[PDB]
Every structure is written in C-alpha cells, then in structure tokens.
Paper text:
Numerous pathogenic D10 variants have been reported, including the first mutation to be identified, p.S59L1. To assess this, we solved the structure of S59L D10-NT fibrils to 3.06 Å resolution. S59L PF-A adopts a fold similar to the WT PF1, except that the beta-helix connecting strands 1 and 3 is disrupted by the flipping of residue 59. S59L PF-B, however, adopts a completely different fold, likely driven by the fact that the WT arrangement could not be maintained with the bulky L59 at the PF interface. The S59L mutation resulted in greatly enhanced D10-NT aggregation rates, as measured by ThT fluorescence. Furthermore, NMR spectra of this mutant prepared freshly in solution exhibited dramatic signal loss in the region corresponding to the fibril core, suggesting that intermolecular interactions are greatly enhanced for this mutant, consistent with its faster aggregation rates. For S59L D10-NT, we obtained two 2D classes that closely resemble those observed in the sample that led to the S59L D10-NT structure, with similar populations.
Here, we demonstrate that the low complexity N-terminal domains of both D10 and D2, as well as the full-length proteins, can form amyloid fibrils in vitro and in vivo. Structures of D10 and D2 fibrils assembled in vitro from the low complexity N-terminal domains of each protein show that their core comprises the most highly conserved region between the two proteins.
Author numbering:
A (entry chain E), B (entry chain C), C (entry chain A): 43 to 75
D (entry chain B), E (entry chain D), F (entry chain F): 44 to 74
The structure:
C-alpha cells in the first residue's frame, strides 16, 4: 500500500506520525456552530 | 501503491506523516454552520 | 503507482506527507452553510 | 555551494482538505 | 556544501483536514 | 557537508484533523 521512509542524518526536532489506514471516519479540522 | 521516501542530511525540524490509505472518509478543513 | 522521493541536503523545516491512496472520500477545503 | 539563507515561514498548512488559511509577510532584506 | 541557514517557522499545521490557520512573518536579513 | 543551521519552530501542529493554529515568526539573521 505505502512504503514510507524518513531518513535524516541530523534532525533538530524529528516528528513522525504513521496511521495504517482511515476507514469511515469524519475528520474535521475546525468546526463552528 | 506508493514508495514514498524523504531523505534529509540536515533538518532543523523534520515532520513526516504517513497514512496507508483513506477509504470512505469525509475530510473537511473548515466547517461553518 | 508513484515512486516519490524528496532529497534535501540542508532543510530548515522539512515537512513531508505521504498517503497511499484515497478511495471514495469527499475532501472539502472550506465549507459554508 | 556557499549560501546564506534566512527563511521565515508562518501559518503554513500542509495536508489534504486545507481550510481557511491567512498570512501576512514582510521582508526588509538588503536594506 | 557550506550553508548558513536560519529558519523561523510559526503556526505550522500538518495533517489531514487542516482547519483555520493564521500566520505573521517578518524578515530583516542582510540589514 | 558543513552547515550552520539555526531553526526556531513555534506552534507546530502535526496530526489528523488539525484545528485552529496561530503563529508569529521573526528573523534577524545576517544583521
């Protein structure tokens, strides 16, 4: 599906998030009434 | 499907997000009533 | 499908997002009532 | 080769379905 | 090769379904 | 190779469904 790879020799701040898959999920950034 | 690769010798701030796949998901950035 | 590759010798801020594929998903940036 | 780089990124939005984004930038280089 | 880099990132939003993002940037390099 | 890097990250938001993000950045490099 996806062979992701991050390779950093020198990283001041290394942030990495991996999600296997998203199925039937409603993702909303900002919501207002 | 996708052979992604990020290679940085020197990164001040390295941010990497990997999602295997999105299936049947309603993604909305900004929502207003 | 896609052999993506990002190669930076020196990056102040390195941001990389990889998605395997999007199937049957309604993606909306800005939504208004 | 040699390169003096000064970058100022503000309000950077990365990702699928990016919503409202606002940004104000100002440069006073080589002054 | 040799590179003097100065980066200033503020308000960086990364991810799916990014909402309201605001940012103000200013550069006074080489002054 | 040789590289002098100075990064200043503030208000970095990483993840799915990122909401309100604000950021102010300023650079005074090479002055």
């Amino acid at each position: 599906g996806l062979m992701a790879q991050m390779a950093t020799t020198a990283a001041g701040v290394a942030v990495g998030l991996a999600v296997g898959h998203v199925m039937g999920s409603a993702l909303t950034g900002a919501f207002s009434g």
